[PDB]
């Protein structure tokens, strides 16, 4: 589909969640509700990835924080790739402030994937995440939520 | 339908900042212009770069303003985009317009103009707070020169200067 | 439109052929049966190309080998380009084994200036075949050699065409 079209820009996905307020209220009522990014390829004939969010958090984060995760998906070129998936990911929640005025301050966490888990192995025929990515008090700060949308940024470090 | 066409709009990104827009059926189109003014041609919306600015190019085959009946008129617009809140405003990147001379580099000369976008110009500021152009980009006489028209088609080129990337030194 | 999006990743096309077993068997049933790549561009607003394979061979490779070809196609930006199309081409049948090292099957060639299909498209230059059909290898890999390693994995093959950005 157009899923195959979606390729990260230098390994980067920017995923936009709109209707944040309505969604938050849903997460609050239903702590299991998950928001999914579009699948993207890291690079051109690379790994398929997807990004996910819990607006009202989950696990330890739950009810207090936003929770961000990523997983591998079965992809067309999987047989050409190194397994497991070993490339570092950086999550950013973007502060939507005009970058002209100041360096905008993003909330960012990065992980190196752990080969000691099955999460990042070759899919067949989730992921890794942060339960306490940002707290609701911090999220209300600055411009993390603006015009009722948030930006989730996923950067995969490329050879 | 119109919907996928919109999602295809999101996939429209510049090639290192460059949009090439092809107008074909030129003689016919020019004619239809003269009959029906003021007739604006629209390029597809494109993003200067990925998660960049959305811009649209415009042309009047039969001119606009100071150009009508004598010139091709070229303009560019800033459009509301999905990632505007991540961007610098007003829009401040060099734009070069070219009309392309369709000769093989076996060496060609296009008609080109550049501007630094004007901060006062209202369209270049953040959407939510009128194309800037050249009314007289090309003379109907000069267009017929060289290869500006070939096989009934013309190429409008918009090159936006992209933000250079800051690296550590190393 | 749907097509004009087909680039061109540093000039690189990877074409995946599914249902290999069924397709190979179909090709046996009809000789001269051609498999076509999606059209692709060397670079954006560049040269338009297409790759094609014969599962059961063409010409001297008929019934014995996979046969691989590339042609120039008429493109929307042809008047902005140099002709004849003179870029180096690499053909690879990918060995689909994890780097943990692939024995890819690869050939590269420089085009000839007198290759008719590689001259500017849209002008008849002798027949339909000189104008429209491409160049390649009638015996890229044999039917036996392909069953080796992971040239086939999960009933698919990977063909890779790399155009050398100069």
Short mmCIF file of C-alpha atoms in Angstrom, two decimals:
data_model
loop_
_atom_site.label_atom_id
_atom_site.label_comp_id
_atom_site.label_asym_id
_atom_site.label_seq_id
_atom_site.Cartn_x
_atom_site.Cartn_y
_atom_site.Cartn_z
CA UNK A 1 0.00 0.00 0.00
CA UNK A 2 1.18 3.48 0.84
CA UNK A 3 2.76 1.93 3.89
CA UNK A 4 5.61 0.90 1.66
CA UNK A 5 5.78 4.48 0.53
CA UNK A 6 6.44 5.63 4.09
CA UNK A 7 10.14 5.82 4.61
CA UNK A 8 11.83 7.66 7.42
CA UNK A 9 13.69 10.79 6.56
CA UNK A 10 17.16 9.87 7.49
CA UNK A 11 15.69 7.38 9.92
CA UNK A 12 13.20 9.79 11.34
CA UNK A 13 9.53 9.53 11.84
CA UNK A 14 7.49 12.44 12.96
CA UNK A 15 4.08 11.23 13.94
CA UNK A 16 1.30 13.55 14.67
CA UNK A 17 -1.50 12.96 17.06
CA UNK A 18 -4.41 15.29 16.71
CA UNK A 19 -7.53 15.54 18.74
CA UNK A 20 -5.39 15.17 21.82
CA UNK A 21 -7.92 16.34 24.36
CA UNK A 22 -10.63 13.96 23.22
CA UNK A 23 -8.12 11.16 23.12
CA UNK A 24 -6.79 11.85 26.55
CA UNK A 25 -10.22 11.49 28.01
CA UNK A 26 -10.52 8.11 26.34
CA UNK A 27 -7.23 6.89 27.65
CA UNK A 28 -8.38 7.96 31.10
CA UNK A 29 -11.49 5.88 30.83
CA UNK A 30 -9.87 2.83 29.37
CA UNK A 31 -6.31 2.53 30.45
CA UNK A 32 -5.55 0.07 27.64
CA UNK A 33 -6.17 2.41 24.68
CA UNK A 34 -3.25 2.74 22.35
CA UNK A 35 -2.39 5.23 19.65
CA UNK A 36 -0.44 3.91 16.71
CA UNK A 37 1.79 5.71 14.34
CA UNK A 38 1.97 4.82 10.73
CA UNK A 39 4.45 2.14 9.93
CA UNK A 40 7.67 3.43 8.50
CA UNK A 41 10.81 1.93 7.07
CA UNK A 42 14.02 2.99 8.63
CA UNK A 43 15.75 3.48 5.40
CA UNK A 44 14.86 2.40 1.93
CA UNK A 45 14.80 -1.36 2.03
CA UNK A 46 14.99 -1.54 5.75
CA UNK A 47 13.16 -2.54 8.84
CA UNK A 48 9.47 -1.83 9.29
CA UNK A 49 8.73 0.01 12.53
CA UNK A 50 5.77 1.44 14.30
CA UNK A 51 5.44 3.82 17.18
CA UNK A 52 2.83 3.68 19.88
CA UNK A 53 1.58 5.81 22.69
CA UNK A 54 -0.42 5.65 25.86
CA UNK A 55 -1.76 9.13 26.51
CA UNK A 56 -2.72 8.37 30.06
CA UNK A 57 0.22 6.10 30.52
CA UNK A 58 0.68 2.49 31.31
CA UNK A 59 2.49 0.35 33.80
CA UNK A 60 4.20 2.61 36.28
CA UNK A 61 3.37 5.61 34.15
CA UNK A 62 -0.24 4.79 34.25
CA UNK A 63 -2.54 7.67 35.10
CA UNK A 64 0.42 9.99 35.59
CA UNK A 65 2.48 10.01 32.44
CA UNK A 66 2.55 9.63 28.72
CA UNK A 67 3.97 6.28 27.61
CA UNK A 68 5.86 5.75 24.33
CA UNK A 69 6.83 2.46 22.69
CA UNK A 70 8.15 1.05 19.43
CA UNK A 71 7.89 -2.31 17.75
CA UNK A 72 9.15 -4.19 14.71
CA UNK A 73 6.75 -5.34 12.12
CA UNK A 74 6.91 -7.98 9.50
CA UNK A 75 8.34 -6.30 6.46
CA UNK A 76 9.06 -7.09 2.83
CA UNK A 77 12.81 -7.04 3.05
CA UNK A 78 13.22 -8.81 6.32
CA UNK A 79 15.14 -11.64 4.72
CA UNK A 80 17.81 -9.19 3.65
CA UNK A 81 18.41 -7.71 7.08
CA UNK A 82 20.60 -8.27 10.13
CA UNK A 83 18.73 -9.85 12.99
CA UNK A 84 18.04 -8.93 15.62
CA UNK A 85 17.33 -5.26 15.12
CA UNK A 86 20.12 -3.52 16.90
CA UNK A 87 19.85 0.16 15.97
CA UNK A 88 19.39 2.85 18.57
CA UNK A 89 16.14 4.68 18.77
CA UNK A 90 15.53 8.10 20.17
CA UNK A 91 12.11 9.20 21.20
CA UNK A 92 11.29 12.87 21.36
CA UNK A 93 8.14 14.65 22.21
CA UNK A 94 8.49 17.84 20.43
CA UNK A 95 8.06 21.19 21.99
CA UNK A 96 6.14 23.20 19.42
CA UNK A 97 7.81 26.52 19.88
CA UNK A 98 9.07 28.57 16.95
CA UNK A 99 12.66 27.60 16.68
CA UNK A 100 13.46 31.16 15.76
CA UNK A 101 12.93 32.54 19.21
CA UNK A 102 14.83 29.90 21.11
CA UNK A 103 16.09 26.41 21.03
CA UNK A 104 12.90 24.53 21.63
CA UNK A 105 13.13 22.04 24.47
CA UNK A 106 12.14 18.55 23.58
CA UNK A 107 11.63 15.76 26.02
CA UNK A 108 13.84 12.96 24.77
CA UNK A 109 14.76 9.41 25.75
CA UNK A 110 17.03 6.96 23.87
CA UNK A 111 17.59 3.23 24.09
CA UNK A 112 19.88 0.72 22.57
CA UNK A 113 17.90 -2.38 21.83
CA UNK A 114 18.68 -5.39 23.96
CA UNK A 115 19.49 -8.65 22.17
CA UNK A 116 18.53 -10.34 25.42
CA UNK A 117 14.92 -10.08 24.52
CA UNK A 118 12.77 -11.53 21.79
CA UNK A 119 11.06 -8.26 21.02
CA UNK A 120 13.45 -7.20 18.31
CA UNK A 121 13.94 -10.49 16.57
CA UNK A 122 12.93 -11.34 13.10
CA UNK A 123 9.21 -11.33 12.89
CA UNK A 124 7.59 -14.48 11.75
CA UNK A 125 4.70 -16.04 9.93
CA UNK A 126 5.49 -4.96 22.18
CA UNK A 127 8.95 -3.67 21.45
CA UNK A 128 10.62 -1.41 23.94
CA UNK A 129 9.18 1.59 25.58
CA UNK A 130 9.01 4.14 28.29
CA UNK A 131 6.15 4.07 30.76
CA UNK A 132 7.12 7.39 32.32
CA UNK A 133 8.16 9.33 29.25
CA UNK A 134 6.64 12.53 30.40
CA UNK A 135 4.36 13.41 33.23
CA UNK A 136 1.12 15.25 32.76
CA UNK A 137 2.47 18.20 34.67
CA UNK A 138 5.48 18.49 32.41
CA UNK A 139 3.33 17.94 29.30
CA UNK A 140 1.32 20.98 30.13
CA UNK A 141 4.47 22.97 30.17
CA UNK A 142 5.82 24.85 27.16
CA UNK A 143 4.40 23.83 23.80
CA UNK A 144 4.24 20.03 23.95
CA UNK A 145 0.54 20.24 23.31
CA UNK A 146 -0.45 22.86 20.75
CA UNK A 147 -3.48 23.42 18.56
CA UNK A 148 -4.55 20.18 20.13
CA UNK A 149 -1.91 18.01 18.65
CA UNK A 150 1.36 16.47 19.71
CA UNK A 151 4.37 15.38 17.78
CA UNK A 152 6.11 12.12 18.41
CA UNK A 153 9.47 11.81 16.85
CA UNK A 154 11.33 8.58 16.38
CA UNK A 155 14.89 8.66 15.22
CA UNK A 156 16.70 5.51 14.17
CA UNK A 157 20.42 5.81 13.94
CA UNK A 158 21.67 4.73 10.62
CA UNK A 159 24.88 3.12 9.53
CA UNK B 1 -11.50 9.76 -5.40
CA UNK B 2 -10.36 13.04 -3.90
CA UNK B 3 -9.23 11.45 -0.64
CA UNK B 4 -6.25 9.35 -1.68
CA UNK B 5 -5.29 12.22 -3.85
CA UNK B 6 -4.92 14.21 -0.63
CA UNK B 7 -2.83 11.53 1.00
CA UNK B 8 -0.67 11.55 -2.13
CA UNK B 9 -0.33 15.25 -1.49
CA UNK B 10 1.50 14.42 1.71
CA UNK B 11 3.99 12.41 -0.27
CA UNK B 12 4.86 15.34 -2.42
CA UNK B 13 8.27 16.48 -1.30
CA UNK B 14 11.03 18.41 -2.98
CA UNK B 15 14.07 16.80 -4.48
CA UNK B 16 16.75 18.47 -2.44
CA UNK B 17 14.22 21.31 -2.32
CA UNK B 18 13.36 21.35 -6.02
CA UNK B 19 9.99 21.05 -7.59
CA UNK B 20 9.73 20.45 -11.29
CA UNK B 21 6.33 21.08 -12.67
CA UNK B 22 5.47 20.08 -16.12
CA UNK B 23 2.89 21.78 -18.22
CA UNK B 24 1.96 20.01 -21.37
CA UNK B 25 -0.48 20.78 -24.08
CA UNK B 26 1.06 24.17 -24.03
CA UNK B 27 -0.23 25.70 -27.23
CA UNK B 28 -3.68 24.56 -26.37
CA UNK B 29 -3.40 25.81 -22.82
CA UNK B 30 -2.10 29.19 -23.77
CA UNK B 31 -4.98 29.51 -26.08
CA UNK B 32 -7.54 28.57 -23.48
CA UNK B 33 -6.01 31.21 -21.31
CA UNK B 34 -6.48 33.97 -23.85
CA UNK B 35 -10.09 33.00 -24.15
CA UNK B 36 -10.85 32.69 -20.43
CA UNK B 37 -8.90 35.04 -18.11
CA UNK B 38 -7.63 35.41 -15.56
CA UNK B 39 -6.57 31.80 -15.79
CA UNK B 40 -4.23 30.42 -13.16
CA UNK B 41 -2.40 27.15 -13.52
CA UNK B 42 -1.57 25.29 -10.31
CA UNK B 43 1.30 23.09 -9.60
CA UNK B 44 0.86 20.40 -7.03
CA UNK B 45 1.46 21.28 -3.42
CA UNK B 46 4.77 20.11 -2.20
CA UNK B 47 6.84 20.11 0.86
CA UNK B 48 10.11 21.80 0.63
CA UNK B 49 11.55 18.99 2.56
CA UNK B 50 10.18 16.24 4.70
CA UNK B 51 8.27 17.68 7.64
CA UNK B 52 9.03 20.97 5.92
CA UNK B 53 6.96 23.82 4.53
CA UNK B 54 4.13 23.31 2.06
CA UNK B 55 4.29 25.49 -1.00
CA UNK B 56 2.32 25.73 -4.20
CA UNK B 57 3.45 27.15 -7.57
CA UNK B 58 1.27 29.24 -9.88
CA UNK B 59 1.35 30.31 -13.45
CA UNK B 60 -0.64 32.39 -15.83
CA UNK B 61 0.08 31.44 -19.37
CA UNK B 62 -1.60 34.65 -20.41
CA UNK B 63 -0.04 36.79 -17.72
CA UNK B 64 -1.38 38.50 -14.66
CA UNK B 65 -1.26 42.09 -13.64
CA UNK B 66 1.52 43.93 -15.33
CA UNK B 67 1.99 40.86 -17.43
CA UNK B 68 -1.23 40.06 -19.15
CA UNK B 69 -1.23 39.37 -22.85
CA UNK B 70 2.51 39.68 -22.94
CA UNK B 71 3.97 37.40 -20.35
CA UNK B 72 3.96 34.20 -18.51
CA UNK B 73 3.36 35.04 -14.86
CA UNK B 74 4.92 33.01 -11.99
CA UNK B 75 4.10 33.04 -8.30
CA UNK B 76 4.54 30.93 -5.17
CA UNK B 77 2.37 30.31 -2.16
CA UNK B 78 2.77 29.11 1.37
CA UNK B 79 0.05 26.75 2.34
CA UNK B 80 -1.10 25.56 5.67
CA UNK B 81 0.84 22.42 6.48
CA UNK B 82 0.78 19.57 8.93
CA UNK B 83 4.09 20.61 10.56
CA UNK B 84 3.89 24.43 10.66
CA UNK B 85 4.33 24.64 14.43
CA UNK B 86 7.72 23.04 14.05
CA UNK B 87 8.90 25.68 11.66
CA UNK B 88 10.49 29.10 11.51
CA UNK B 89 8.21 31.96 10.58
CA UNK B 90 8.03 33.93 8.56
CA UNK B 91 9.15 31.66 5.74
CA UNK B 92 12.61 32.77 4.89
CA UNK B 93 14.25 30.47 2.37
CA UNK B 94 15.58 31.44 -1.00
CA UNK B 95 13.32 30.60 -3.87
CA UNK B 96 14.60 30.30 -7.39
CA UNK B 97 12.16 30.10 -10.22
CA UNK B 98 13.38 28.70 -13.51
CA UNK B 99 11.77 28.17 -16.84
CA UNK B 100 13.56 25.34 -18.32
CA UNK B 101 15.38 25.22 -21.60
CA UNK B 102 14.88 21.72 -22.87
CA UNK B 103 18.18 21.11 -24.54
CA UNK B 104 20.48 18.17 -24.03
CA UNK B 105 23.61 18.96 -22.06
CA UNK B 106 25.38 17.92 -25.22
CA UNK B 107 24.72 23.34 -22.86
CA UNK B 108 21.49 25.08 -21.88
CA UNK B 109 20.29 28.36 -20.50
CA UNK B 110 17.16 28.76 -18.55
CA UNK B 111 15.41 31.90 -17.49
CA UNK B 112 15.71 32.15 -13.72
CA UNK B 113 14.98 34.39 -10.77
CA UNK B 114 15.70 34.23 -7.05
CA UNK B 115 14.36 36.08 -4.10
CA UNK B 116 14.72 36.19 -0.43
CA UNK B 117 11.19 36.00 0.72
CA UNK B 118 9.88 39.14 2.23
CA UNK B 119 9.09 39.05 5.92
CA UNK B 120 6.39 41.69 5.55
CA UNK B 121 4.81 39.73 2.80
CA UNK B 122 1.80 38.32 4.52
CA UNK B 123 1.65 34.90 2.89
CA UNK B 124 5.12 34.06 4.07
CA UNK B 125 4.10 34.28 7.67
CA UNK B 126 2.51 31.61 9.74
CA UNK B 127 -0.70 30.41 8.22
CA UNK B 128 -3.58 31.27 10.48
CA UNK B 129 -2.24 34.66 11.50
CA UNK B 130 -1.54 35.97 -2.05
CA UNK B 131 1.37 34.60 -4.00
CA UNK B 132 4.55 36.52 -4.35
CA UNK B 133 5.62 36.46 -7.93
CA UNK B 134 6.92 37.85 -11.16
CA UNK B 135 4.18 39.25 -13.31
CA UNK B 136 6.60 39.37 -16.22
CA UNK B 137 8.78 36.31 -15.91
CA UNK B 138 8.89 35.42 -19.55
CA UNK B 139 7.85 37.28 -22.70
CA UNK B 140 5.57 35.48 -25.05
CA UNK B 141 8.20 36.28 -27.59
CA UNK B 142 11.16 34.89 -25.66
CA UNK B 143 9.30 31.75 -24.74
CA UNK B 144 9.37 30.80 -28.39
CA UNK B 145 13.11 31.14 -28.36
CA UNK B 146 15.39 28.20 -27.81
CA UNK B 147 13.75 25.20 -26.17
CA UNK B 148 11.42 26.73 -23.69
CA UNK B 149 8.73 24.90 -25.52
CA UNK B 150 9.38 21.41 -26.71
CA UNK B 151 6.82 18.81 -27.64
CA UNK B 152 4.12 21.14 -26.45
CA UNK B 153 5.40 21.20 -22.92
CA UNK B 154 7.03 23.50 -20.45
CA UNK B 155 8.96 22.96 -17.23
CA UNK B 156 8.57 25.31 -14.27
CA UNK B 157 11.25 24.76 -11.71
CA UNK B 158 11.05 25.94 -8.12
CA UNK B 159 14.17 25.51 -6.07
CA UNK B 160 13.92 26.26 -2.40
CA UNK B 161 17.13 26.60 -0.47
CA UNK B 162 17.04 24.12 2.27
CA UNK B 163 18.28 24.58 5.76
CA UNK B 164 21.77 23.26 6.00
CA UNK B 165 22.42 20.76 8.75
CA UNK B 166 24.53 21.52 11.78
CA UNK B 167 26.92 18.81 12.66
CA UNK B 168 29.49 18.56 15.24
CA UNK B 169 32.90 19.09 13.89
CA UNK B 170 34.93 16.03 14.65
CA UNK C 1 1.12 9.39 -10.63
CA UNK C 2 1.19 6.17 -8.74
CA UNK C 3 4.10 5.34 -11.00
CA UNK C 4 5.83 8.68 -10.98
CA UNK C 5 6.66 8.08 -7.37
CA UNK C 6 8.98 5.27 -8.27
CA UNK C 7 12.58 6.20 -7.45
CA UNK C 8 15.38 5.61 -7.17
CA UNK C 9 17.15 5.29 -3.86
CA UNK C 10 20.51 6.49 -4.75
CA UNK C 11 19.59 4.89 -8.06
CA UNK C 12 18.66 1.58 -6.59
CA UNK C 13 15.76 -0.66 -7.29
CA UNK C 14 14.99 -3.78 -5.42
CA UNK C 15 12.36 -5.80 -7.06
CA UNK C 16 10.82 -8.66 -5.19
CA UNK C 17 9.21 -11.48 -7.01
CA UNK C 18 6.64 -13.41 -5.07
CA UNK C 19 5.12 -16.79 -5.82
CA UNK C 20 8.29 -17.97 -7.44
CA UNK C 21 7.40 -21.57 -7.58
CA UNK C 22 4.10 -20.89 -9.17
CA UNK C 23 5.58 -18.35 -11.55
CA UNK C 24 8.42 -20.61 -12.64
CA UNK C 25 5.94 -23.32 -13.37
CA UNK C 26 3.78 -20.91 -15.34
CA UNK C 27 6.78 -19.88 -17.38
CA UNK C 28 7.50 -23.42 -18.31
CA UNK C 29 3.95 -23.69 -19.58
CA UNK C 30 4.47 -20.62 -21.71
CA UNK C 31 7.91 -20.01 -23.19
CA UNK C 32 9.02 -16.44 -23.62
CA UNK C 33 7.06 -15.41 -20.55
CA UNK C 34 8.16 -12.13 -19.11
CA UNK C 35 8.16 -10.67 -15.65
CA UNK C 36 8.30 -6.94 -15.34
CA UNK C 37 9.61 -4.70 -12.73
CA UNK C 38 7.79 -1.61 -11.69
CA UNK C 39 9.01 1.41 -13.55
CA UNK C 40 11.60 3.34 -11.71
CA UNK C 41 13.61 6.51 -12.02
CA UNK C 42 17.31 6.89 -11.57
CA UNK C 43 16.80 9.93 -9.53
CA UNK C 44 13.93 12.32 -9.22
CA UNK C 45 13.05 13.87 -12.55
CA UNK C 46 15.50 11.40 -14.01
CA UNK C 47 15.70 8.52 -16.44
CA UNK C 48 12.93 5.98 -16.48
CA UNK C 49 13.85 2.32 -16.43
CA UNK C 50 12.31 -1.07 -16.17
CA UNK C 51 13.78 -4.42 -15.28
CA UNK C 52 12.56 -7.71 -16.56
CA UNK C 53 13.23 -11.33 -15.81
CA UNK C 54 12.57 -14.59 -17.55
CA UNK C 55 12.07 -17.25 -14.91
CA UNK C 56 12.53 -19.98 -17.43
CA UNK C 57 15.07 -18.15 -19.54
CA UNK C 58 15.26 -16.28 -22.79
CA UNK C 59 17.33 -16.85 -25.84
CA UNK C 60 20.30 -18.96 -25.02
CA UNK C 61 19.10 -19.36 -21.48
CA UNK C 62 15.70 -20.66 -22.35
CA UNK C 63 14.63 -23.50 -20.13
CA UNK C 64 17.91 -23.41 -18.24
CA UNK C 65 18.47 -20.04 -16.53
CA UNK C 66 16.90 -16.92 -15.23
CA UNK C 67 17.28 -14.20 -17.80
CA UNK C 68 17.67 -10.57 -16.80
CA UNK C 69 17.19 -7.41 -18.83
CA UNK C 70 16.92 -3.64 -18.48
CA UNK C 71 15.26 -1.09 -20.78
CA UNK C 72 14.93 2.61 -21.10
CA UNK C 73 11.38 3.76 -21.07
CA UNK C 74 9.90 7.02 -22.23
CA UNK C 75 9.91 9.46 -19.44
CA UNK C 76 8.38 12.75 -18.55
CA UNK C 77 11.76 14.48 -18.10
CA UNK C 78 13.49 13.16 -21.13
CA UNK C 79 14.21 16.50 -22.67
CA UNK C 80 16.19 17.60 -19.64
CA UNK C 81 18.51 14.67 -19.76
CA UNK C 82 21.64 13.52 -21.53
CA UNK C 83 21.38 10.94 -24.26
CA UNK C 84 22.37 8.32 -24.76
CA UNK C 85 21.88 6.92 -21.25
CA UNK C 86 25.40 6.01 -20.32
CA UNK C 87 25.37 5.11 -16.65
CA UNK C 88 26.88 1.91 -15.24
CA UNK C 89 24.45 -0.78 -14.26
CA UNK C 90 24.76 -3.50 -11.67
CA UNK C 91 22.50 -6.50 -11.64
CA UNK C 92 22.25 -8.59 -8.51
CA UNK C 93 20.30 -11.66 -7.55
CA UNK C 94 20.28 -11.36 -3.83
CA UNK C 95 21.20 -14.18 -1.55
CA UNK C 96 18.76 -13.76 1.32
CA UNK C 97 20.86 -14.81 4.25
CA UNK C 98 21.45 -12.70 7.35
CA UNK C 99 24.78 -10.97 7.53
CA UNK C 100 25.81 -13.47 10.18
CA UNK C 101 28.07 -13.40 4.42
CA UNK C 102 25.76 -13.16 1.46
CA UNK C 103 26.86 -14.69 -1.83
CA UNK C 104 25.07 -12.31 -4.08
CA UNK C 105 25.02 -12.97 -7.80
CA UNK C 106 26.11 -9.82 -9.57
CA UNK C 107 27.03 -8.40 -13.00
CA UNK C 108 27.88 -4.87 -14.10
CA UNK C 109 28.14 -3.31 -17.50
CA UNK C 110 28.74 -0.02 -19.15
CA UNK C 111 26.23 0.76 -21.85
CA UNK C 112 27.25 1.13 -25.46
CA UNK C 113 26.59 4.47 -27.21
CA UNK C 114 25.14 2.59 -30.21
CA UNK C 115 22.53 0.85 -28.17
CA UNK C 116 19.32 1.96 -29.69
CA UNK C 117 17.03 1.56 -26.74
CA UNK C 118 19.44 3.66 -24.78
CA UNK C 119 19.21 6.58 -27.15
CA UNK C 120 16.59 9.18 -26.61
CA UNK C 121 13.18 7.61 -26.38
CA UNK C 122 10.35 8.16 -28.75
CA UNK C 123 12.08 8.03 -32.08
CA UNK C 124 11.89 4.91 -34.22
CA UNK C 125 15.38 3.63 -34.82
CA UNK C 126 15.14 0.42 -36.82
CA UNK C 127 12.44 -1.85 -35.49
CA UNK C 128 10.36 -2.09 -32.39
CA UNK C 129 12.98 -4.11 -30.61
CA UNK C 130 15.91 -1.85 -31.19
CA UNK C 131 13.78 1.04 -29.96
CA UNK C 132 12.00 -0.60 -27.02
CA UNK C 133 13.77 -3.62 -25.58
CA UNK C 134 16.69 -3.73 -23.27
CA UNK C 135 19.95 -5.33 -22.44
CA UNK C 136 21.02 -7.88 -19.94
CA UNK C 137 21.91 -11.47 -19.36
CA UNK C 138 20.21 -14.44 -20.98
CA UNK C 139 22.02 -16.71 -18.49
CA UNK C 140 22.25 -14.80 -15.23
CA UNK C 141 21.83 -17.86 -13.04
CA UNK C 142 21.00 -21.50 -13.83
CA UNK C 143 18.02 -23.37 -12.44
CA UNK C 144 20.24 -25.59 -10.41
CA UNK C 145 22.41 -22.83 -9.01
CA UNK C 146 19.41 -20.88 -7.82
CA UNK C 147 18.08 -23.69 -5.65
CA UNK C 148 21.34 -23.21 -3.80
CA UNK C 149 21.70 -21.06 -0.69
CA UNK C 150 18.97 -18.51 -0.20
CA UNK C 151 18.52 -17.13 -3.69
CA UNK C 152 15.06 -18.34 -3.05
CA UNK C 153 13.56 -17.73 0.42
CA UNK C 154 9.91 -18.06 1.36
CA UNK C 155 8.98 -18.44 -2.27
CA UNK C 156 10.45 -15.10 -3.45
CA UNK C 157 13.52 -13.74 -5.14
CA UNK C 158 15.14 -10.38 -4.90
CA UNK C 159 16.45 -8.64 -7.98
CA UNK C 160 18.45 -5.52 -7.49
CA UNK C 161 19.37 -2.97 -10.13
CA UNK C 162 21.85 -0.30 -9.30
CA UNK C 163 22.46 2.65 -11.57
CA UNK C 164 25.71 4.38 -10.96
CA UNK C 165 25.19 8.01 -10.07
CA UNK C 166 28.17 9.60 -11.63
#
